[model samples]
Target: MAARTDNSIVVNAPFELVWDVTNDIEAWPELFSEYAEAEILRQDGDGFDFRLKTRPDANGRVWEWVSHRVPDKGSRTVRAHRVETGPFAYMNLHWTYRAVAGGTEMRWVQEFDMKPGAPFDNAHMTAHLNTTTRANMERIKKIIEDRHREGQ
Candidate 1:
């Protein structure tokens, strides 16, 4: 079976600024604490293949995977998925951005299935995703709002 999660947060910044910062793959390590490294393996226009290395987990194990992401700025939407699936049978992500009254609303819709006999099952992963996604969004919200105030 598959698991799905939808999460959204409004950033207190202009749409352009929020979009620019979040889409900058190179800056992801600074934006998301879970990632220790983000390397661009290839790029074409606003689409790219990137490798993300996670910091050591509680067990001192690091996880890394390759992913492809394509952003359609005209539509303010992005499509992404895991290229190196690892423990996932499949994973897909859709991100949308919209300019709201105070700032921009960014939403992420994720769908995935865990590989059979994986350490974590779909239900477990879904719970983890819900927890981590909210934390990450809050982290991003603070970072973007701070940058917006700094005029960067």
Candidate 2:
């Protein structure tokens, strides 16, 4: 079985801005310090496919993988799955955005299994991914909220 994690953050910003900020995949590398680059492969009305590369880790190894993502503007949700498995048996992600009294409530869920013989164990990877994801979410919240405070 794969290790799974679900996370959420409340942002004091407009729903539209929060949605757009999350959907702007191309800007992820810049918004998230862990990623080094993102290369879009294709796009259609339904969704898009892209490859993401992370900055070298402490071991000087860079991780890269491809994924297909579809966003439902009406539902304010996104579904994505890995196309290039890399070190994982598979990785899938889901994001949901909802309007709330304060502003917008954002949620993210991740599911993935480590490939057999992969360098990292499932538990370790799960903990690491959860930590990294939470930190990234904080970065996103700060960036978007700061931009709003600046009247952007």
Candidate 3:
């Protein structure tokens, strides 16, 4: 069965700034500590193809995958799906943003199904995704807030 993880964070930055910064796929290596490289494979209108390489793990192994992301600024949402699902039957993500009083509220909703005989089950993967997603969201908040204060 599939599992879902929903995580949200309020970035102390304007909606436009948050949206632009986060959607800049080329800048993900800087924004995300976990990613060592983010390569833009090609562009198709509002959608982009990307090959991302994660930073080396404890065992000095790096994980890699390709995905496609389509951002709709009018609706303030992005839909993404993995092109090369590593250990998953399918992996999809939805990102939404809203302009709140203090700043922008950004949410990430991920739905994934692990392949049979995978290392982790859906329940464990769901928890792992939630924890990792929360940490990354907080880091993004700090980065965006700092940029906002600097008037960038």
Candidate 4:
């Protein structure tokens, strides 16, 4: 499996606040640009099972995936696994949150592998994906920080 990872700005909000906000998938579209839509398909005590469609542009080259999010309150980590259908085959994304001075340090690790005979090479895809993911994280950070400033 090929992987791409990134870490973004250390938010200034409290760890609990950040964790709570991150767990709220309904608020993602407003905070994360790549996700065009997300719908929860099911939920249990362990996590939420959902479907997501993400795109980068208006041309609408999108990918869909089924994801399960498992949040560990004790460790402040969210472990997620997503299986892609259609263009890609599999993607497993893991995110960890660590308490910092004022808030939390967020890190994401994504390991994905395309279907056999896929067009893109790993190196190129990795670079592009990492760049885009980093941008998305920055956007999230901005939204969260703004919300904190607004006392939300």
Candidate 5:
């Protein structure tokens, strides 16, 4: 497995609000600007299976994939794996939230293996993930913080 990525963003909000916004897969479409829709297919033991559809890429390419997510509220973390990987051989992602200096620092780490026959290799995937994930984190912070400040 190559293309390992770990990113974090400091959110100016309480842990509860940050965690709720980020962990709510059903609300990702509204919270994450990259997402067009997130449909919960079924619930498993602790989490659920879902299909996430993303908006067009820079080249006007749309994509969708299925994944399973389970959150551990006690630890303020989430463990997930892609069930329907398209160009990836395997994919695993983790989301963790911690109370830092002035607020909560939300962290996301994803490890994946790019298929040999895929259009992109580990380097490409790593760069793409880092760029897009960082933008998504910014969106998460703005949306959650703004909503919290708005009393919504």
Candidate 6:
């Protein structure tokens, strides 16, 4: 399995505010370019199932992921497991929020295994994923912080 991790900007907002924004999956497609569609399949207790469609490639590869979110200790942390389907044989994602000096520190870690026939050079793919994920995080930080500033 390969793992990718990244950090966004330091948010000058409360941890609860950051967590609330992250939990809003429906807003992702509009904020992130890589995601074409996102749909919530089911919600049970603190966990929910979702399906996401990503941008297509030249080879007509459209990655679909079904994930279940489990919250730990109220809702400060979320652990997600991608259903064993599509191009991934295994996938896991973790989102953690911590109070920082100014506001909150948001971090994400994602691990997955590509299908046997997936057309990806492992090293290059890892680098690409990390870069893209970091970019997305930076975008999120900007969006949220701008909203915060507007309220001031």
Candidates in order have lDDT scores of 0.93, 0.90, 0.92, 0.76, 0.90, 0.76
Candidate 2: which stretches are off by over 4 Å?
none
- Residue 33 error for model 3, in Å? 1.6
Residue 34, model 6, lDDT: 84
Worst 10 residues of 5 by lDDT: 17-26
- TM-score, structure 5 vs. true: 0.94
Question: What does candidate 3's lDDT look like per residue over 73-104, in tens digits?
Answer: 99999999999999899999999999988899
Q: Give the clash total for candidate 1.
A: 0
Error of 3 at 11 (Å): 0.9
Q: Compose the digit string of candidate 6's lDDT tens values, residues 39-124.
A: 99999987889988888854577777788878674657889988746655666888888888988887788777676786664565
**How close is each model in CA RMSD to the real structure?**
1.3, 1.2, 1.3, 2.2, 1.4, 2.3
**Model 1 weakest lDDT span, ten residues long:** 54-63
What's the count of clashing pairs in each model shown? 0, 0, 0, 0, 0, 0
Give TM-scores for every candidate, taking all chains together and pairing residue i with residue i.
0.96, 0.95, 0.95, 0.86, 0.94, 0.85
Report the C-alpha lDDT of model 1 over 62-131, residue by residue, as the tens digit.
Answer: 9999999999988999999999999999999999999989999999999999999899999989999988
Candidate 2 per-residue lDDT, tens place, 24-114, comes to 8889887888889988899987989998999998689999988999999899899999999888998999999989898898999999999
RMSD of candidate 1 to true structure, Å: 1.3
Model 2 scores worst on lDDT over the 10 consecutive residues at 21-30
lDDT of 4 by residue, 14-43 (tens): 887778787788877767787888888898
Show model 4 residue runs off by greater than 4 Å.
55-59
In model 1, the clashing pairs are none
Score residue 134 of candidate 2 by CA lDDT: 95
**lDDT value, candidate 4, whole model:** 0.76
